[PDB]
Amino acid sequence: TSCNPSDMSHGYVTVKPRVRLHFVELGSGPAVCLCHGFPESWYSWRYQIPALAQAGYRVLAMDMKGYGESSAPPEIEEYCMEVLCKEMVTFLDKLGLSQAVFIGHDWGGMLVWYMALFYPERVRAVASLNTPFIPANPNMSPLESIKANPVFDYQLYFQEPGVAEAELEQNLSRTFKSLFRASDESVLSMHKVCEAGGLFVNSPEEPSLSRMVTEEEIQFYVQQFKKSGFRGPLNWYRNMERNWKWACKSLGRKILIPALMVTAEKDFVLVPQMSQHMEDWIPHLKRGHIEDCGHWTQMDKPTEVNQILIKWLDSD
Ligand SMILES: COc1cc2c(cc1OC)[C@H]1C[C@@]3(C)C[C@@H]2C[C@@](NC(=O)NC2CCN(C(=O)C4CCOCC4)CC2)(C1)C3
């Protein structure tokens, strides 16, 4: 049901000089690669690694670049989609892996999406939790698509180096106790974060422990964000220009490999309606849906999650 880090097989792979990637491996069979979201760790797949291995799979759960035991280079440009995706491929190469299944959640959702577009020969199959695939529009700058959706106002507060960093890093134990909750325990409003001066502004001094997590697991995340900081994780937000430009090349291409889109009903930012037309560009796309389910899907509803994937991995 869970995973003891000191009971794992720990692996590391240098993909570039200052850049080594660490992961956790378990099981045999076809190779599955799990890529986490923000601000998390391979540990947030702790309910899915073991169930997946038992279904007959070679599972590799990752510390995405900038997190945990993976390297956190100081340059923002190192964090754009095009640079990260290529490093995934070098990753597969140095293990003798010709192809793989990729399954991403949140930001990791977007990464898994760029692989099936640009490197579909190494991608056996692709799946995403929350994150929808929406083709860029060549005539809407990214800062415009923020005007028309102020739910995303928080991205601007994130753009300035230093600022957002200070808030999340002053008291780490409060940050994760504040963030990792279910929708009905929420202590954040994404409405005018830029104006109010931050996120943890209307949030109590001593948050209560939510129902979903233990006082240990908060310590786990707390200690991982002690070596690297929040500079790395926040920079995944600050490459919107290049990502629009690179992405513009996909126009016309259609992913044709086996695919699956899974939405959650209490994610009020990565909202389900945002994927309504993903079938026009992905003709083979299967779907799933979960209810009562917020953002931290795997932690809230792990059994629903496990059943949907495993039924889909064995379908094709
Ligand atoms: C309910 O209230 C919540 C609100 C949030 C979160 C949890 C919540 O509790 C439940 C957490 C924490 C944070 C700090 C703020 C916000 C949202 C958080 N996640 C996020 O910002 N992910 C980004 C990467 C993937 N993105 C896309 O792929 C495309 C881009 C263009 O098209 C639209 C989707 C865009 C967003 C995920 C970031």
Side-chain angles (χ1 to χ4, degrees), residues 14 28 33 41 51 111-112 131 134 136 153 176 212 223 225 235 259 294 298 303 308 316:
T14 302
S28 69
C33 178
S41 178
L111 192 95
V112 286
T131 303
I134 295 296
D153 182 67
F176 294 107
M212 313 183 293
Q223 293 296 111
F225 290 65
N235 285 2
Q298 322 102 301
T303 311
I308 299 157
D316 58 16

Side-chain angles (χ1 to χ4, degrees), residues 105 130 264-272 293-297:
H105 162 244
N130 302 17
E265 158 192 69
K266 302 288 186 172
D267 196 303
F268 293 139
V269 181
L270 289 175
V271 188
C293 196
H295 176 61
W296 321 108
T297 306

Side-chain angles (χ1 to χ4, degrees), residues 188-200:
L188 298 175
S189 72
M190 289 291 103
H191 175 264
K192 292 178 178 185
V193 172
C194 203
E195 185 58 43
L199 197 44
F200 306 152

Side-chain angles (χ1 to χ4, degrees), residues 36-80:
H36 72 82
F38 178 82
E40 297 175 319
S41 178
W42 76 268
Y43 192 60
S44 176
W45 304 87
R46 74 198 90 104
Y47 308 123
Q48 296 67 18
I49 309 147
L52 279 179
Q54 298 181 11
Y57 288 100
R58 188 186 168 173
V59 171
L60 288 85
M62 312 259 0
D63 274 347
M64 300 303 278
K65 193 173 102 174
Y67 300 83
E69 292 202 14
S70 287
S71 301
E75 292 79 7
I76 297 185
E77 310 79 290
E78 290 265 21
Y79 300 94
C80 65

Side-chain angles (χ1 to χ4, degrees), residues 12-297:
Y12 316 78
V13 173
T14 302
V15 293
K16 277 159 62 153
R18 299 183 184 160
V19 161
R20 205 188 45 183
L21 301 193
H22 150 264
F23 59 121
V24 171
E25 191 172 31
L26 165 70
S28 69
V32 176
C33 178
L34 320 193
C35 316
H36 72 82
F38 178 82
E40 297 175 319
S41 178
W42 76 268
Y43 192 60
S44 176
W45 304 87
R46 74 198 90 104
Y47 308 123
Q48 296 67 18
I49 309 147
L52 279 179
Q54 298 181 11
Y57 288 100
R58 188 186 168 173
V59 171
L60 288 85
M62 312 259 0
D63 274 347
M64 300 303 278
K65 193 173 102 174
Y67 300 83
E69 292 202 14
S70 287
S71 301
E75 292 79 7
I76 297 185
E77 310 79 290
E78 290 265 21
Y79 300 94
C80 65
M81 274 283 136
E82 183 178 353
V83 176
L84 296 177
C85 285
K86 288 189 202 294
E87 293 177 356
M88 287 303 301
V89 176
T90 298
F91 185 106
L92 301 168
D93 291 338
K94 311 181 81 162
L95 273 164
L97 296 153
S98 73
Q99 84 184 178
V101 180
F102 290 75
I103 299 162
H105 162 244
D106 185 59
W107 271 105
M110 197 169 279
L111 192 95
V112 286
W113 278 128
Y114 281 124
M115 303 286 296
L117 283 179
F118 288 111
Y119 295 94
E121 65 283 346
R122 322 297 307 275
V123 165
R124 170 87 194 157
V126 74
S128 166
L129 319 169
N130 302 17
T131 303
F133 173 55
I134 295 296
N137 170 252
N139 261 329
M140 286 286 289
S141 159
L143 189 67
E144 309 264 46
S145 291
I146 283 7
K147 287 198 209 148
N149 220 339
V151 55
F152 293 123
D153 182 67
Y154 71 116
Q155 293 195 169
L156 301 159
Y157 170 61
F158 273 180
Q159 300 297 309
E160 178 81 53
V163 186
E165 281 90 8
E167 187 185 8
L168 295 149
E169 299 170 348
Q170 187 53 246
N171 185 253
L172 291 181
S173 177
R174 176 179 188 239
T175 305
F176 294 107
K177 275 186 204 196
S178 321
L179 293 156
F180 292 167
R181 309 170 154 244
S183 38
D184 61 8
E185 307 164 337
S186 170
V187 303
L188 298 175
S189 72
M190 289 291 103
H191 175 264
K192 292 178 178 185
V193 172
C194 203
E195 185 58 43
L199 197 44
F200 306 152
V201 167
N202 80 316
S203 35
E205 271 196 4
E206 45 176 354
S208 60
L209 202 59
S210 168
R211 71 166 180 249
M212 313 183 293
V213 314
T214 69
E215 187 60 45
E216 291 199 303
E217 294 166 327
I218 293 288
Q219 286 317 126
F220 181 73
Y221 283 103
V222 159
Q223 293 296 111
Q224 292 263 96
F225 290 65
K226 300 285 181 287
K227 294 178 181 178
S228 310
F230 262 105
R231 184 191 165 91
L234 285 168
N235 285 2
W236 287 60
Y237 278 109
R238 311 168 171 165
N239 291 282
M240 290 184 303
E241 219 44 73
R242 288 175 226 189
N243 288 334
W244 186 48
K245 298 187 171 184
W246 184 46
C248 279
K249 307 163 70 154
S250 66
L251 299 174
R253 257 187 272 325
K254 272 188 203 193
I255 300 163
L256 308 144
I257 63 182
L260 165 87
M261 169 86 228
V262 187
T263 51
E265 158 192 69
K266 302 288 186 172
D267 196 303
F268 293 139
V269 181
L270 289 175
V271 188
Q273 300 87 293
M274 278 169 45
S275 76
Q276 54 184 350
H277 288 125
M278 279 181 9
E279 299 159 13
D280 294 341
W281 295 272
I282 300 159
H284 290 56
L285 184 96
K286 303 176 91 75
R287 285 186 183 260
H289 194 86
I290 302 176
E291 271 139 358
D292 202 17
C293 196
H295 176 61
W296 321 108
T297 306

